[PDB]
Nucleic acid binder design. Structure first.
Ligand SMILES: [K+]
Ligand SMILES: [K+]
Ligand SMILES: [K+]
Ligand SMILES: [Mg+2]
Ligand SMILES: [Mg+2]
Ligand SMILES: [Mg+2]
Ligand SMILES: [Mg+2]
Ligand SMILES: [Mg+2]
Lengths: 54, 56, 291, 147, 95
RNA sequence: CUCGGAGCAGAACCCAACCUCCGAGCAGUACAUGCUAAGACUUCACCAGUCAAAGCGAACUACUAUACUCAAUUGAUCCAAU
């Protein structure tokens, strides 16, 4: 099929991917009582340490 | 309280990993040898009863 | 310009400001409440009988006899040894670049804790088990300054950022006494004590500071060229030849492992009043301070 | 100048010299000049950034010709119409780490091609279904009555 | 609680608290589960996993523990390689 | 004097009496009753308790196989033993 796109149709080959809906999480609360420590990771964008103003 | 039937024993892995798990056995039966999953070696291995923990 | 000029010409036509016409700003003086009168008297907000009104309710944390929350939870060593844990104030490359751009830290001279503290770049608390500064990678993408900087800890990516721009980074240990002195030298000089020697790292930290990967100050200089080249390869930049730089001598300036300050040796007494330096000549003293 | 018993000269007498630690070793696998490195923001706004490294695989002379031909087959899905092998990493906030990831992928590609591993890898689940489907497609294949 | 000590006239910490709870700088308190080392032979795997979790306290308990500890225990610490470093700061928290 | 089922309490939940009845303080089979993790339930607080997709690792192409049958079948912290 790459030959058809590149040679016959004279175009770049379109590639597609099956994308799943983003996972659901309930609204984050200030005191997540009785939830495990990993609760906080569910609402974290990045995995690399942050240092704020410092 | 007086009644007594089973006992709790420590089953120790024969793989030398030191992994142990506790199981219940009848007091009047012979020492247990069981095939149980050992996380250290990550596959099922033989376990042999070593000590009685308590009376159940 | 309706503010400054309108507020002062309008004062010309008002009575003189005196001790008889002053008042606090509204909202700064909340009223005081007294147990007098119908509203606030009688039981005076204490309720009726019980321990409440009499002032004898149990201690904080007591739950009426039920095994309290703060006791029925099992003990666990979350905070075990907290007071003996080493701490390092983070210094980001963003903050370091910011300080250089504003003239608060001078990149033309070696940068150590003293210069960082004097520029009010970082605040170190030796009494709170701070052992110095840790250079963190935040801001590496936009860090452009060429510096010779001495820190206590440095991340691999932070080291790469310093050395891609042609700078030099070294990791240097300071014991608690030395750290206090190097951070606030003037208070130390007013004690009239000879400059002490900097102690060696504890045994558990000797591997860190004797390793070229961390640019340890006790590491073999012959191993630095390879370590510097590895980071250049890993992060896709060309290692500059700093030997050809005009600031090469400054970039190489490093403290002796027993030296707290550049140009000052252990056992010297600083006479600030007379702006002099006293050096001991006794052989036994010189052996002690040089060992 | 102050020198104590723990001076680097005394600790490492063989490594003396002001230039010892600052020399660049003369004796270079991936030439950065030959790579086109671009930086953008991945879905940014998403916190992580993106680094892209693209080079013309066939023209690249720093890769052995047999290695060039085996990479083109294995990673045909990463080669565009112009013939440039495009690698992208967006796993970090820092452009440095993203570029380092892309460069390591190039080094892994060359290593895998040269290794020529004959070890039988474990079949993935998606591949298992395709194997059955390919088997039945061959089973429907016919031959001409009169060839 | 000792609100004013006889020697310093200062508030004191209840050390029973320090031995059981971790305070994250954002205000959250972490604890272990009661009974997580008790009679494991009679408890199911799912229950035992629940008992091993490190969990957060509620608002009321957090307020209580804050009162039972002095300011020293609420400062921002920079321990080297702290396992809990990431959890000291909240992210994407609304209201 | 703790725990479970039923009536009072007829239909979401909850609901008392020195109210009316019956029970529990185990047993049996497994030895992956391994690990891990979305989202939820909750005995009116807390503590405790309960159910779980996906995933890893197993089992598996005969086993209503995947959080065992079972209603309750139970005991915090400190401390002790190891
Ligand atoms: K009143
Ligand atoms: K009233
Ligand atoms: K503790
Ligand atoms: Mg009256
Ligand atoms: Mg009265
Ligand atoms: Mg009363
Ligand atoms: Mg509830
Ligand atoms: Mg599943």
């Amino acid at each position: 099929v790459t030959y058809i796109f590149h040679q016959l149709l004279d175009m770049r080959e379109p590639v597609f991917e099956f994308v799943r809906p983003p996972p659901y999480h309930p609204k984050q609360k200030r005191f997540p009582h009785r939830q495990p420590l990993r609760y906080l990771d569910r609402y974290r964008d990045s995995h690399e340490p942050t240092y704020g103003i410092y | 309280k007086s009644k007594s039937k089973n006992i709790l024993v420590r089953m120790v892995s024969e793989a030398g990993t030191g992994f142990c798990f506790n199981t219940k056995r009848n007091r009047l039966r012979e020492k247990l040898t069981l095939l149980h999953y050992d996380p250290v070696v990550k596959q099922r291995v033989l376990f042999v009863e070593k000590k009685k923990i308590r009376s159940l | 310009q309706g503010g400054g000029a309108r507020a002062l010409d309008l004062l010309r036509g008002l009575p003189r400001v005196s001790l008889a016409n002053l008042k606090p700003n509204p909202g700064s003086k909340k009223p005081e409440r007294r147990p007098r009168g119908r509203r606030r008297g009688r039981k005076c907000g204490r309720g009726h009988k019980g321990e409440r009104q009499r002032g004898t309710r149990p201690r904080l944390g007591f739950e009426g006899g039920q095994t309290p929350f703060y006791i029925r939870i099992p003990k666990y060593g979350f905070n075990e040894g907290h007071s003996f844990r080493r701490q390092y104030k983070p210094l980001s490359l963003n903050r370091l670049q910011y300080l250089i751009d504003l003239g608060r830290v001078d990149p033309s001279q070696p940068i150590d804790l003293t210069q960082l503290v004097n520029g009010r770049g970082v605040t170190i608390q030796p009494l709170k088990r701070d052992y110095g500064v840790q250079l963190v990678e935040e801001g590496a993408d936009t860090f452009t300054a060429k510096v010779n900087i001495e820190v206590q800890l440095a991340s691999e990516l932070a080291i790469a950022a310093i050395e891609k721009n042609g700078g030099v980074v070294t990791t240097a240990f300071y014991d608690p006494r030395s750290l206090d002195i190097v951070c606030k030298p003037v208070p130390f000089f007013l004690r009239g004590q000879p400059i002490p020697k900097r102690m060696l790292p504890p045994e558990e930290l000797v591997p860190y500071y004797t390793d070229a990967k961390n640019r340890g100050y006790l590491a073999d200089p012959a191993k630095f060229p390879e370590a510097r080249l590895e980071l250049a390869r890993k992060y896709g930049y060309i290692l500059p030849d700093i030997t050809k730089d005009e600031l090469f001598k400054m970039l190489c300036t490093r403290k002796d492992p027993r030296q707290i300050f550049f140009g000052l040796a252990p056992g010297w007494v600083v006479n600030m009043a007379d702006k002099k330096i006293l050096k001991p000549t006794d052989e036994n003293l010189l052996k002690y301070y040089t060992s | 100048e102050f020198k104590s018993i723990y001076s680097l000269d005394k600790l490492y007498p063989e490594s003396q010299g002001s230039d010892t630690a600052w020399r660049v070793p003369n004796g270079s696998d991936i030439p950065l000049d030959r790579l086109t490195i671009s930086y953008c923001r991945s879905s940014g706004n998403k916190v992580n950034s993106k680094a892209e490294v693209r080079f013309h695989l066939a023209t690249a002379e720093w890769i052995a010709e047999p290695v060039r031909q085996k990479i083109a087959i294995t990673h045909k899905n990463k080669i565009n119409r112009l013939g440039e092998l495009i690698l992208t990493s967006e796993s970090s906030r820092y452009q440095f780490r993203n570029l380092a990831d892309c460069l390591q992928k190039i080094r892994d590609m060359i290593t895998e091609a040269s290794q020529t591993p004959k070890e039988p890898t474990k079949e993935d689940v998606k591949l298992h279904r395709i194997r059955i489907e390919n088997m039945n497609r061959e089973r429907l294949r016919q031959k001409r009555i009169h060839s | 609680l000792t609100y004013f000590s006889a020697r310093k006239g200062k508030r004191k910490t209840v050390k029973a608290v320090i031995d059981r709870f971790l305070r994250l700088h954002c205000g959250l308190w972490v604890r272990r589960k009661a009974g997580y080392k008790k009679k494991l032979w009679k408890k199911t795997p799912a229950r035992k996993k629940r008992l091993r979790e490190f969990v957060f306290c509620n608002k009321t308990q957090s307020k209580l523990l804050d009162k039972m500890t002095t300011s020293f225990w609420k400062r921002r610490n920079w321990y080297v390689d702290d396992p809990y470093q990431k959890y000291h700061d909240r992210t994407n928290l609304k209201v």
